[PDB]
Amino acid sequence: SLKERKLAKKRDELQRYVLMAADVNLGQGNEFRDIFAKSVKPLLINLDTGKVDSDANVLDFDERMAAINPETSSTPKKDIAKIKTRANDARVFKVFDDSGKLSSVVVPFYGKGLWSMIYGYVAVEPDFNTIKGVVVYEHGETPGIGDFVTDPHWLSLWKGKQLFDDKGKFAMRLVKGGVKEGDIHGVDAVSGATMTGRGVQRAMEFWFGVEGFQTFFNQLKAS
């Protein structure tokens, strides 16, 4: 029962994170639960094949646990995000507007910053390139330096940016020179905290890379 309250608490935070990333209004009170239930379709997908896998309670799926279990995980070839081990399946979310048309796909990403693992979600538009929103919800980086990652002021900068170039190659780079509106692959680095930012950069590089959600996206582009 203590289990239920905990799961109930994390499911609420999860629902809010996903809607926030997808730029959907959470409504007032507990309406976010109803909005999520109507406009979001949780999915467990096989990262290698891109196929949808089955689970009785997708929202309660423990991705931390799945990543370390030897029978449901593997070691990445190019461990860019320094995660050491990767789950076979990932939980993703398809988000639809009121018209019922696909609005975005929200996927989990995480990777080592400078001193700790950083966890979050990225919402991408149906072109699977343009970012609809980034939400970081957990980290262990030094407060006052690397804890900017959870600051909405900084996270909002990612909106509208594009992950890949015309060669289909990951192109996002954190920039210190001060990013201009036309720099669609650039995000402002937080001076004095560059190493954390490069971690987030590498986190997305992996999870939108060949060992990440690329197969899954290529499957959606087809059918």
Numbering used by the authors: 0, 33 to 254
Please give the exact wording used by the authors of the publication that reports this structure.
We recently reported a flavin‐trafficking protein (Ftp) in the syphilis spirochete Treponema pallidum (Ftp_Tp) as the first bacterial metal‐dependent FAD pyrophosphatase that hydrolyzes FAD into AMP and FMN in the periplasm. Orthologs of Ftp_Tp in other bacteria (formerly ApbE) appear to lack this hydrolytic activity; rather, they flavinylate the redox subunit, NqrC, via their metal‐dependent FMN transferase activity. In the current study, we identified a bimetal center in the crystal structure of Escherichia coli Ftp (Ftp_Ec) and show via mutagenesis that a single amino acid substitution converts it from an FAD‐binding protein to a Mg2+‐dependent FAD pyrophosphatase (Ftp_Tp‐like). A high‐resolution structure of the Ftp‐mediated flavinylated protein of Shewanella oneidensis NqrC identified an essential lysine in phosphoester‐threonyl‐FMN bond formation in the posttranslationally modified flavoproteins.
We obtained several crystal forms of the in vitro flavinylated S. oneidensis NqrC protein (lane 11), expressed in a soluble version minus the N‐terminal membrane anchor, and phased the structure via the single‐wavelength anomalous dispersion method using the selenomethionyl‐substituted protein. There are four independent monomers of NqrC_So in the asymmetric unit, and the r.m.s.d. for superposition of these monomers ranges from 0.3 to 0.7 Å for over 214 Cα atoms. John Wiley & Sons, LtdThe modified threonine (T225) lies at the N‐terminal end of the C‐terminal alpha helix of NqrC_So, in a groove formed by a number of conserved protein side chains. Surface representations illustrating the electrostatic potential of the NqrC_So structure reveal the high solvent exposure of the phosphoester‐threonyl‐FMN residue (47% solvent accessible surface exposure for the threonine side chain; 55% exposure for the isoalloxazine ring of the FMN; 49% exposure for the remaining atoms of the FMN). An electrostatic potential calculation of the NqrC_So flavinylation target site shows that the environment in the binding cleft for the FMN is positively charged. One of the highly conserved residues in the NqrC/RnfG proteins is K207. The side chain of this residue is located near the nucleophilic T225 and the phosphate of the pT‐FMN modification. In solution at physiological pH of 7.5, this lysine in the isolated NqrC protein is solvent‐exposed and protonated, but in complex with its cognate Ftp protein, the lysine would be buried from the solvent in the FAD binding pocket. Interaction with the negatively charged phosphate of FAD may abstract a proton to yield the free‐base form of the conserved lysine, which would reduce the pKa sufficiently to allow deprotonation of the T225 hydroxyl. The K207A mutation exhibited no detectable in vitro flavinylation activity (lane 12), confirming the hypothesis of essentiality.
